[PDB]
Amino acid sequence: IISLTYKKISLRDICLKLNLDSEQTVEYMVSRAIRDGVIEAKINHEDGFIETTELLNIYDSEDPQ
């Protein structure tokens, strides 16, 4: 939910929203989860936020086949 609603959101805010313990703790969550593709995002470790990568419009890709 947090990733869909806020495209770019610092881990700091997620801690506030979902009461996670620290920046690290949620970092680990996302890191494991995107290997599975659940969240479908990429982390910005230097800038301190999660940047979502879902954008859509695969009627330019070859996906429909």
């Binding site: 009627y59 330019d60 070859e62 429909p64 086949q65």
Partner: protein, 290 residues
């Protein structure tokens, strides 16, 4: 005189005629047959309506020695003029397996009767190849950039076949076959597809080994042959361009209609599925009284 031979339409009647005359003189073992070609000219398409044989004995010591009856020709022409008066000399057919350079001197002889540029129609009587058994040529004068003066030479004319409405239905009456080159049903175009692709693959193989024969075996260099290959390379399609991405998008669209129509027919057949089963229930009642 002129070049107006851009298309040559050939009646199927003439091809059948050519084989009949070839056998009824029984010219075999590298003997030739020559007959006149009658038909229209002064039109970009050349219409081959009719032919008739001329007596022509071709030597076996040489190819430069032949007998041809000039007096015969006019008589055949005036008679056929009485039948239909749209027929004039437009050339002569040679029935050899392939082309000769002693046909050039014969070509010049028929230039006298014509008011067009003589068509040499090599009617093959060997039915070689799955495509046409006709190549066409017309004798034309050129100079060329090599340093060659006043050449006479034969330039290939693309060959096509047209037939009249009465003529075409005669074929249909005679034959009932379904034609390995036909583009009919799904299975038939599937066969045409693989046949067409391998057709190109054969011709391209010849060019590659023809190029070797120029540059190691000293076949002649000509700018008409090199120039055509240049065109191929210059207008060659390219992929990964924005043209390619639109193709793929056009390609999903066609895959989309197919998927819709696949689902549509499942509904119709499932309707039949039910109705066989209802009919069974009724027929069970009938069977019990029976």
């Amino acid at each position: 005189m002129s070049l107006q031979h851009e298309k040559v339409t050939i009646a199927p009647l003439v091809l059948l005629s050519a084989l009949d005359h070839y056998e009824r003189t029984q010219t075999k073992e590298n003997k030739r047959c020559v007959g006149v070609i009658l038909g229209d000219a002064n039109s970009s398409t050349i219409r081959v309506t009719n032919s008739f044989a001329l007596p022509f004995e071709e030597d076996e010591k040489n190819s430069d020695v032949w007998f041809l009856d000039h007096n015969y020709i006019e008589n055949m022409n005036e008679m056929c003029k009485k039948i239909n008066a749209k027929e004039k000399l437009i050339g002569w057919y040679h029935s050899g397996p392939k082309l000769r350079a002693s046909d050039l001197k014969i070509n010049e002889l028929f230039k006298k009767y014509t008011q067009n540029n003589p068509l040499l129609l090599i009617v093959d009587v060997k039915q070689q190849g799955v495509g046409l058994p006709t190549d066409a040529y017309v004798a034309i004068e050129q100079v060329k950039d090599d340093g060659t003066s006043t050449e006479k030479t034969f330039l290939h004319l693309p060959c096509t076949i047209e037939a009249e409405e009465a003529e075409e239905i005669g074929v249909e009456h005679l034959l009932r076959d379904v034609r390995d080159q036909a583009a009919g049903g799904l299975s038939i175009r599937l066969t045409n597809q693989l046949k067409s692709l391998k057709g190109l693959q054969s011709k391209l193989k010849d060019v590659v080994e023809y190029l070797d024969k120029v540059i190691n075996k000293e076949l002649p260099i000509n700018h008409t042959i090199l120039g055509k290959l240049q065109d191929v390379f210059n207008l060659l399609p390219n992929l990964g361009t924005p043209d390619d991405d639109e193709i793929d998008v056009e390609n999903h669209d066609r895959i989309n209609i197919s998927n819709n129509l696949q689902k549509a027919l499942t509904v119709k057949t499932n309707d039949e599925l039910m109705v066989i089963y209802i009919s069974n229930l009724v027929r069970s009642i009938i069977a019990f009284d029976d």
